[PDB]
Design a protein around this ligand. Structure first.
Ligand SMILES: *[C@@H]1O[C@H](CO)[C@@H](O[C@@H]2O[C@H](CO)[C@@H](O[C@@H]3O[C@H](CO[C@H]4O[C@H](CO)[C@@H](O)[C@H](O)[C@@H]4O)[C@@H](O)[C@H](O[C@H]4O[C@H](CO)[C@@H](O)[C@H](O)[C@@H]4O)[C@@H]3O)[C@H](O)[C@H]2NC(C)=O)[C@H](O)[C@H]1NC(C)=O
Ligand SMILES: *[C@@H]1O[C@H](CO)[C@@H](O[C@@H]2O[C@H](CO)[C@@H](O[C@@H]3O[C@H](CO)[C@@H](O)[C@H](O)[C@@H]3O)[C@H](O)[C@H]2NC(C)=O)[C@H](O)[C@H]1NC(C)=O
Ligand SMILES: *[C@@H]1O[C@H](CO)[C@@H](O[C@@H]2O[C@H](CO)[C@@H](O[C@@H]3O[C@H](CO)[C@@H](O)[C@H](O)[C@@H]3O)[C@H](O)[C@H]2NC(C)=O)[C@H](O)[C@H]1NC(C)=O
Ligand SMILES: *[C@@H]1O[C@H](CO)[C@@H](O[C@@H]2O[C@H](CO)[C@@H](O[C@@H]3O[C@H](CO)[C@@H](O)[C@H](O)[C@@H]3O)[C@H](O)[C@H]2NC(C)=O)[C@H](O)[C@H]1NC(C)=O
Ligand SMILES: *[C@@H]1O[C@H](CO)[C@@H](O[C@@H]2O[C@H](CO)[C@@H](O)[C@H](O)[C@H]2NC(C)=O)[C@H](O)[C@H]1NC(C)=O
Ligand SMILES: *[C@@H]1O[C@H](CO)[C@@H](O[C@@H]2O[C@H](CO)[C@@H](O)[C@H](O)[C@H]2NC(C)=O)[C@H](O)[C@H]1NC(C)=O
Ligand SMILES: *[C@@H]1O[C@H](CO)[C@@H](O)[C@H](O)[C@H]1NC(C)=O
Ligand SMILES: *[C@@H]1O[C@H](CO)[C@@H](O)[C@H](O)[C@H]1NC(C)=O
Ligand SMILES: *[C@@H]1O[C@H](CO)[C@@H](O)[C@H](O)[C@H]1NC(C)=O
Ligand SMILES: *[C@@H]1O[C@H](CO)[C@@H](O)[C@H](O)[C@H]1NC(C)=O
Ligand SMILES: *[C@@H]1O[C@H](CO)[C@@H](O)[C@H](O)[C@H]1NC(C)=O
Lengths: 118, 132, 453, 132, 118, 132, 53, 53
């Protein structure tokens, strides 16, 4: 019954600071869960960006993301936000907010195409 | 589960796991112990009971070897009659609940041994800094 | 070695005299009785049984029962508790009404007046439209003649309203243990011979005091802690006469007190759920309440206190007693609360004696007020409910409260009169042993050790 | 007495003995300092006064060299004008009450000296860990 | 006015765990006192087993008792208990609970003969 | 001013000066944080809010490297993106208010880094004392 | 034929204020510091015994 | 500013009930005048000039 909805741009210039924000309803943020961001370049496979936890885990990302990704949780607004500084046009991808639980990523967001273009 | 690999989640999350796995996650159970016209009396007695229990635990630690080290090796030995099990088995085999059920009898003698060891270490350090 | 450094020692045993609040404690046997038919075992923590009376040795502390604290706090606590056990109970505002009183049906002589007056009066029922005519009995000390006919009113009805006591809550004393909170300790002077002031060479610390039952008495304080061997008199200054003299004697004197008038209570409905408890019939003879004492034991204890009082006033000194010189009622007699009803009993039979330097029973009549105004407030009076049955009580007289007359002009005799005075002199008869001190840790002291870097 | 030989008994038991004998028994006087509809206000103000006094003492220690060491050698010297007695005499001759009567005047200057010594040690340790 | 009364067996098998329990009335347990166990083989002298304290002393026994003696105090029941694991038939003795104070062992228990027999 | 030369006065006195000058006077702002029939409820909730805030700060310190050292070097590095200024300039150029305005965003990640560093130091010390 | 109220010979009565309504607002119970509330999330659970989840 | 009631008053205790005292007004001893306040004309004009400025 959980519902995740992304919000933010889908068209940004390269070499800028990208930031989305996924709203969460149907459940609580501070659960046994990793509120995660996972992307997918178009026509290609998935690409797991990273997560954050509603407990007190430090967020751990994919090291291929080059330390430009800061996922920040907002427990007072039931949200959690992706960041991506210094984007390129090759970073055009569908973005997905999701929730790792005792099962693997049950409720996703719908996933929105961020097309980085200059 | 979700916290597999990087073994952590919220407080009391490690309570089902073995004590060896639970030993790496102790800061949050320590954290969620203090913070959280007649009903104000109930709220106030709850808050002061919480800080009284926390201060009793910090004073029990402070008279031992560790003020706030949160993991303390010390100088008292271990009677093997108390545990009477394989040592590395209990860190992959037992929960903290089952371990506290095991040493329920063997309690309150350990604390006096800790106090004797700490006072003996204090008088030895006083002699050591005295003759120097 | 002469390069002395300093060291802080935390948890040093050392105290100072202080004045802090205290800690109620009641025994759990009084907690076993349901719904608090005595006051406040819910407003008072249960006593941990047999607490730590750990002795102290080679320690000399100066005690002073006269400038002592915690007797003021005991007085304030008992006053506030007595107030807090009346706010549930029924106010007697509609009872202030014109009373048509006559004498009780009795073959009364014209000399001895009837102590009990029958009084009929109007009273509101539960329904506001209908009033009833009802009768009751009252004492002479509760009615006055407002002004042919003879009509009275109650005594309190032009100074204050009165609160009828609830017949649930009883006034019999349960023992109160006083306890110090954290960071304070109660030093009990365990000296056998100790006159209340000065250095006590054998003290012992404690966390909780002994059982102090709060009794209410003016002269002849009841059921207190008796002394070990001797009979000890205590005064703030014996040469002073404005201060009282607390006499605590060794063997407790058995006193028997009774009202033999059998009473029937009667519930009169003041209004919706308002019950008033009047006196109905006197089943049987109309007699007078009295308190006995044993003649030989009282003469012996008076000999003991004469033998002890001659220490402070020279050997060749005549010591005589007299009764109270006057004042209000409840300082002339000696007053108490037996079975939940108040006695004011005359003491002239106990204090007519003189003493030169070389199977019977004393009866003494009492009087029974139904209303009381104890502690002498400005606007409170407690009405007491009349209780069923012939009422008797046995008690152990423990000490007296005496007062020397202001003797001048070269007299050998020095007379003594029992004077009630303040109620605090009761509690000063039970808090002479204890004092409260504040523990101060972290002493500092020079020694030879330097903290390495 | 009963506690002869093995010199210990309950709290304030060493208060009559000399300060050298009483120095070995300090853990319990430290222990019996914290634990122990309108009367609840009295109970609550007693409890919070107790924990306020205990927290003031722990903060007075914590700004000095020792957090909870309970015996602290330190770096401030001792003016011999204050004690002006034989050093080993006072540990076999004086009670803590008599010693506190002796240095009643010489107080509250020692505490500022302790604070100056601790802040000087902190800036020296900061410089030492800085240049390394 | 103190009164100490032992309770427990007087006939046990050897190579077993012996345990008595002495009830205390007339005073408090947490006093300036060592609530002690002292035994006596029949026809012979006394044998001090050990003590426990109502303060916070660690209990100290006779080292001839071979570390099989654990005296445990019960302040909530005003009692204190002797233990003796791995008994022998030569440990048949009158057992005594007592109280060391400022005077030396004023109030004893009555003392009961534990006859260890197989 | 009056406190020129010997740079000290009462609490919040250094609040106008630079953080390098204010760093030498920290004991009193730490000091004036604890000590100081229905109004008793207000007094009591003020006092227990004060001791709850003080205990939360002492517990936040105690789970880090320093219990009561009041100046703590530690093992976490510094991202230069956060400060992005000249290092010795800020100790002669900035107030603590302006510095707290600067690192308002860069907060609450530092504290988890401190906890990770302290737990890593604890498991390293446990291994070091274990193999010895 | 004259009546009275039913309560007028046992107790006084308090008229409820028309401001305060008796409709239930949901109460959440919470534990204070140092305590936690364990919720047995078992589907089939008859109130007594071991709850495995 | 000076303010006065010049009507002299005598209070009078009326007993409402048991220990209930009510304090009514008795006699007007003297003239029946009107309570009034005074302020200095020049200082008030000066302060009004100040607040105008
Ligand atoms: C506490 O207890 C004491 C001890 O009893 C009480 O003291 C007694 O008090 C009464 C009065 O309060 C004293 O007075 C006595 O009254 C008797 C009755 O009075 C009638 O007779 C006289 C004529 O004698 C009439 O004038 C009067 O109107 C009555 O009709 C008298 O008979 C007594 O006289 C005694 O002395 C004379 C001396 O000549 C003898 O001839 C008589 O035979 C008789 O013995 C006396 O007047 C009484 O004296 C007190 N007792 C003692 C032993 O002295 C206290 O009153 C009580 N406290 C309180 C508050 O009540
Ligand atoms: C209880 O309430 C009743 C009801 O009011 C009271 O009775 C009334 O009392 C008044 C005052 O005395 C009586 O007035 C006088 O009556 C006499 C005798 O009739 C008459 O001679 C006078 O001129 C005057 O009228 C009134 O009659 C009387 N009513 C009744 C029905 O008795 C009563 O006094 C109250 N108290 C008691 C103790 O009963
Ligand atoms: C203490 O004892 C003395 C006696 O040793 C008491 O003195 C006596 O006091 C009573 C009244 O207080 C006197 O009674 C008188 O009776 C007549 C009879 O009607 C009356 O008209 C008088 O007005 C007075 O009441 C009595 O005479 C008197 N005794 C002597 C010998 O004079 C004193 O009252 C006692 N005090 C207390 C508090 O009991
Ligand atoms: C004062 O103490 C004694 C109690 O031992 C009581 O004194 C008694 O006073 C009455 C007064 O009538 C004496 O009665 C008569 O005395 C004459 C001598 O004056 C005697 O000849 C008569 O036969 C009759 O007994 C009574 O004797 C006397 N008692 C003694 C032992 O002499 C009195 O009760 C006390 N005073 C008060 C106010 O209580
Ligand atoms: C007070 O009343 C008590 C009632 O119990 C009396 O005590 C009894 O006295 C009789 C007579 O000597 C004895 O035979 C009984 O054995 C006593 N019983 C008890 C329980 O003590 C007492 O004597 C009375 N005292 C006075 C002074 O009247
Ligand atoms: C208000 O009343 C006070 C009463 O004291 C007046 O003050 C006095 O005024 C007279 C007249 O000038 C002086 O002689 C006194 O010296 C004043 N006494 C004091 C204590 O000030 C005051 O003038 C009145 N003010 C107005 C505006 O009427
Ligand atoms: C703990 O002691 C009790 C006796 O009080 C005993 O019955 C129980 O078996 C002991 N526990 C264990 C695990 O042996
Ligand atoms: C008290 O007893 C002694 C001894 O019998 C006697 O001499 C004395 O008169 C008695 N006192 C009184 C007041 O009767
Ligand atoms: C402490 O100072 C006072 C002066 O305030 C002085 O009278 C007293 O003698 C001093 N104490 C000692 C032990 O010298
Ligand atoms: C802090 O973050 C906000 C965005 O929430 C940003 O607008 C602001 O510029 C940042 N502060 C600084 C000093 O850059
Ligand atoms: C105030 O004083 C000035 C100067 O005398 C005058 O011109 C003005 O009219 C005064 N104001 C009033 C209201 O009288």
């Amino acid at each position: 019954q959980v519902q995740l909805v992304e919000s933010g741009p889908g068209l940004v210039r390269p070499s800028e600071t990208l930031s989305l924000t996924c709203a969460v309803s149907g459940a609580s943020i501070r659960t046994k869960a990793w509120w995660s961001w996972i992307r997918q370049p178009p026509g290609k496979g998935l690409e797991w960006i990273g997560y954050v936890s509603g407990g007190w885990d430090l967020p751990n990302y994919n090291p291929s993301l080059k330390n430009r990704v800061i996922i920040l949780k907002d427990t007072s607004l039931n949200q959690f936000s992706l960041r991506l500084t210094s984007v390129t046009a090759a970073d055009t991808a569908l973005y997905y907010c999701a929730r790792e639980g005792p099962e693997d990523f049950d409720v996703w967001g719908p996933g929105f195409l961020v097309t980085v273009s200059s | 589960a979700v916290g597999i690999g990087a073994v952590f989640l919220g407080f009391l999350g490690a309570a089902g796991s073995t004590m060896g796995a639970a030993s790496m996650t102790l800061t949050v159970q320590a954290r969620n112990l203090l913070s959280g016209t007649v009903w104000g009396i109930k709220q106030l007695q709850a808050r002061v009971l919480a800080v009284e229990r926390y201060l009793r635990d910090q004073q029990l630690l402070g008279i031992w070897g560790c003020s706030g080290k949160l993991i303390c090796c010390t100088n008292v030995p271990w009677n093997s009659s108390w545990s009477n099990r394989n040592l590395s088995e209990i860190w992959d085999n037992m929960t903290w609940l089952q371990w506290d059920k095991e040493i329920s009898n063997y309690t309150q003698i350990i604390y006096g041994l800790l106090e004797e060891s700490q006072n003996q270490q204090e008088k030895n350090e006083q002699d050591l800094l005295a003759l120097d | 070695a002469e390069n002395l450094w300093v060291t802080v020692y935390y948890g040093v045993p050392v105290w100072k005299d202080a004045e802090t609040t205290l800690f109620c404690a009641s025994d759990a046997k009084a907690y076993e009785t349901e719904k608090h038919n005595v006051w406040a075992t819910h407003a008072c923590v249960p006593t941990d049984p047999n607490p730590q009376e750990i002795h102290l040795e080679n320690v000399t502390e100066e005690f002073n029962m006269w400038k002592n604290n915690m007797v003021e706090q005991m007085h304030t606590d008992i006053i506030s508790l007595w107030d807090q056990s009346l706010k549930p109970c029924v106010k007697l505002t509609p009872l202030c009404v014109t009373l048509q009183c006559t004498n009780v049906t009795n073959n009364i002589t014209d000399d001895m007046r009837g102590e009990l007056k029958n009084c009929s009066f109007n009273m509101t029922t539960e329904l506001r439209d209908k009033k009833q005519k009802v009768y009751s009995l009252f004492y002479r000390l509760d009615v006055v003649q407002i002004n042919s006919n003879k009509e009275y009113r109650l005594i309190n009805c032009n100074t204050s309203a009165c609160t009828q006591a609830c017949p649930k809550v009883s006034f019999e004393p349960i023992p109160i243990h006083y306890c110090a909170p954290a960071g304070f300790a109660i030093l009990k002077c365990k000296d056998k011979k100790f006159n209340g002031t000065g250095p006590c060479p054998s003290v012992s610390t404690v966390q909780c005091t002994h059982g102090i039952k709060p009794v209410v008495s003016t002269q002849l304080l009841l059921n207190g802690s008796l002394a070990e061997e001797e009979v000890m008199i205590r005064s703030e200054n014996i040469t002073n006469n404005a201060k009282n003299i607390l006499v605590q004697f060794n063997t407790p004197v058995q006193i028997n007190c009774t009202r033999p008038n059998n009473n029937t209570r009667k519930s009169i409905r003041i209004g919706p759920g308002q019950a008033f408890y009047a006196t109905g019939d006197i089943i049987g003879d109309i007699r007078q309440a009295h308190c006995n004492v044993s003649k030989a034991t009282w003469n012996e204890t008076l000999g003991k206190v004469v033998k002890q009082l001659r220490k402070h006033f020279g050997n060749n000194t005549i010591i005589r007693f007299a009764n109270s010189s006057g004042g209000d009622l409840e300082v002339t007699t000696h007053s108490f609360n037996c079975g939940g009803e108040f006695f004011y009993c005359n003491t002239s039979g106990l204090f007519n004696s003189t003493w030169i330097s070389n199977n019977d029973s004393i009866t003494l009549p009492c009087r029974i007020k139904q209303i009381i105004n104890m502690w002498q407030r400005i606007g409170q009076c407690m009405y007491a409910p009349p209780i069923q049955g012939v009422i008797r009580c046995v008690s152990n007289i423990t000490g007296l409260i005496l007062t020397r007359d202001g003797g001048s002009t070269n007299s050998t005799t020095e007379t003594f009169r029992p004077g009630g005075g303040d109620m605090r002199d009761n509690w000063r008869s039970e808090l002479y042993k204890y004092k409260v001190v504040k523990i101060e840790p972290l002493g500092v002291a020079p020694t030879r050790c330097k903290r390495r870097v």
